[PDB]
Amino acid sequence: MAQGEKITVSNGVLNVPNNPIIPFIEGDGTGPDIWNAASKVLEAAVEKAYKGEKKITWKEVYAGEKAYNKTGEWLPAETLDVIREYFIAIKGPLTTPVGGGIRSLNVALRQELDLFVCLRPVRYFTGVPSPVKRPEDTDMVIFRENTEDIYAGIEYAKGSEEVQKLISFLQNELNVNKIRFPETSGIGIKPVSEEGTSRLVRAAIDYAIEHGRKSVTLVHKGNIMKFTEGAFKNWGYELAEKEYGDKVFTWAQYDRIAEEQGKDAANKAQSEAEAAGKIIIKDSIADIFLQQILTRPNEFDVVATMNLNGDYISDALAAQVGGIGIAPGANINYETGHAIFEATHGTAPKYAGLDKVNPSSVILSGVLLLEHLGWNEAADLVIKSMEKTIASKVVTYDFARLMDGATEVKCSEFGEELIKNMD
Amino acid sequence: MAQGEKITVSNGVLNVPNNPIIPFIEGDGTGPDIWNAASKVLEAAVEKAYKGEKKITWKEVYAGEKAYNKTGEWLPAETLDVIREYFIAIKGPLTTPVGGGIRSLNVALRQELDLFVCLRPVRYFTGVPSPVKRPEDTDMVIFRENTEDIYAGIEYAKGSEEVQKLISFLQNELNVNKIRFPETSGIGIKPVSEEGTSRLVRAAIDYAIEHGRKSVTLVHKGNIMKFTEGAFKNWGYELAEKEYGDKVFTWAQYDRIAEEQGKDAANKAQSEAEAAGKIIIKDSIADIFLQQILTRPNEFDVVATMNLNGDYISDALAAQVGGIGIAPGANINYETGHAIFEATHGTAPKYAGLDKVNPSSVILSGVLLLEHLGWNEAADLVIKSMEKTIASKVVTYDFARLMDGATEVKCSEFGEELIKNMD
Description:
Two copies of one chain form a homodimer.
Chain A: E1 8-10, E2 13-15, E3 21-25, H1 31-50, E4 57-60, H2 65-71, H3 77-86, E5 88-91, H4 105-112, E6 117-123, E7 139-145, E8 155-156, H5 161-173, E9 185-193, H6 194-210, E10 215-220, H7 229-244, E11 248-250, H8 251-261, H9 263-275, E12 279-285, H10 286-295, E13 302-305, H11 307-320, E14 328-332, E15 339-343, H12 360-373, H13 376-392, E16 394-395, H14 397-400, E17 407-408, H15 411-420
Helix pairs in contact in A: 1-12, 1-13, 1-15, 6-7, 8-9, 10-11, 12-13, 13-15
């Protein structure tokens, strides 16, 4: 559009103008309500932090219900082209049909734009009602591989000629005898690669280094899925040692020391590496990890895992700190500079247009957007206000009905309270 | 045919002699310590319950490291044969290597003996230390499909001739273009069938009816894996309505009424079904389920899910109520009568031989075994004593170091306290 200038990228590094054009997708259901509040909170933070020197120019693009109704398409090619060209976008909730229909629009965006990292930071905000005793012990950053795994969408339906072809090939060419009920089976394909794992783990480690995080935990179900999830664990340790040998201490290295010199030697080497500021690269079996995030959350910092595990872990963590409707998220390609910041919750249609939805998820994803732009002073203004506002108990219905003595406010009003509290 | 006798089955119902021979696998790590205490507690309950009329004759079989040391085989045919002939067995943990090595022996047993249901009861014992505020709200029974899904063990590693053939087939013959990095991918195959789903769901519903549970929740990630997990959801709803029409009210039914007669007609029908004592068949997307078991666990009773989801869900729930040191499990083929009882997880291998670990998981698995035999009085004696013992705060270290004023005891001594507490 006329007003504003395009962000550009040189070698994955963003060239951000003072007046960047930022595309946005409103989202379906409660999306429009959240967007009205979130956009204004973010704008306020930018003007207050930079005294008018900077300003965002929003540019609407369509996806989901709004796009179907307006263009007859759920994800216009135009939307993808605009995101590819302007690099950084923010989006509200989109709808996905179960058991059938078109494949997830959210996943289409991730795959088509190759936004390989799903970044999910999870922390506790004082005042938020939580189902666990010590939610404050949770402070992690999840790096979820976002382009492969079972999300590839490679599957064939029971009764289709394609599943029959696939089963015949597996049985006759690969002598597979482990399919329990081959006549009534639907089949899914799960790809996990060295290339996909490497770029994801690299981003996880880079983040741990830059933010002074103490460890990166590789999460996998490698005992059962040896050549995909088990391979992920090995590829991750290998990358860590090959590219960050001087800054990290891995458990694979711990394994070798233990075998060659004993465990006393290994425990001693790990302790010295920590004292020396080395980042510990460790791993946790997925099912066990789901237990330990509840019982020993303080043992985890940065977490690197696959698409499916990441989806489950992120949600389990968000519920733990009582942040189910306020968790921020970012889909980022760290090599090309592209990123889509988004609402991590559903469209919650029941309240569409009622102005009562909690806009915090989009607001916090906007905080990630601001940090990605390098506008940290603005980002910090939003975080601090969010902290104070939630602690004051002037919150939307979802929090209010769980707290005692809360002042339930509308979505727009909550947005206003955040701005009010920015100083 | 000496002193102890073999259990036999009649059209699916167990004919249990009063002096049954029950095979057992000691297991790796702390398996031997647990088995020494567990066996005596179970024997004590049998003796105290039936005044000497009954006696269990344990028969050791080998699997894992112990079997390899003795025979050069990880799972001797004889072990399978003895378990198959004697019908019911109890086992300690068996270690599965990550990323290579042998395929899970725990899974091999389940497959070989077609033990299609992994039954995981989850309830809170007063006094047990928990990370959540209200562990008392959690009372569920997980029915995990135990013979298919990604656990089939169908996968090929990067660089293998097999993965090359598979990838080429998918790309050239099925026109797959969604494998992000075909040159460095390992590939896993995920089968989910109508036959497998049906027998699992049938067992879950039968259990709900039999035990007066109010609902059966189908857990799946069908919005992403449409033809496997989405198909499981549909097949589960279909079976419910086709075979248990008069006894249930499903959400699928709810939606059809809405489509046809509106939301009010559908709301009226559900209430009338509640009133009439009909079991509610509903569903939850797996990632959201992981949040809901923390925020509103009282909304779930019986849960029916696939192999992988069942693994994750069971562990996440167990962490709310004591964890691995107390979580029991049962692998059961409801049609043939065969069953293997076991704890969900292994280790604290650094405690192997130190008489420290909690033997409760295997003891509670023994309670499921007693119930499976139809020896409910013996089973109830164990439950009552476990409730009495834990509440008295005379527990092992895993619990002791989390309570205040607990009397920490050895593994063997915890067993003696339980026998002591048998009323």
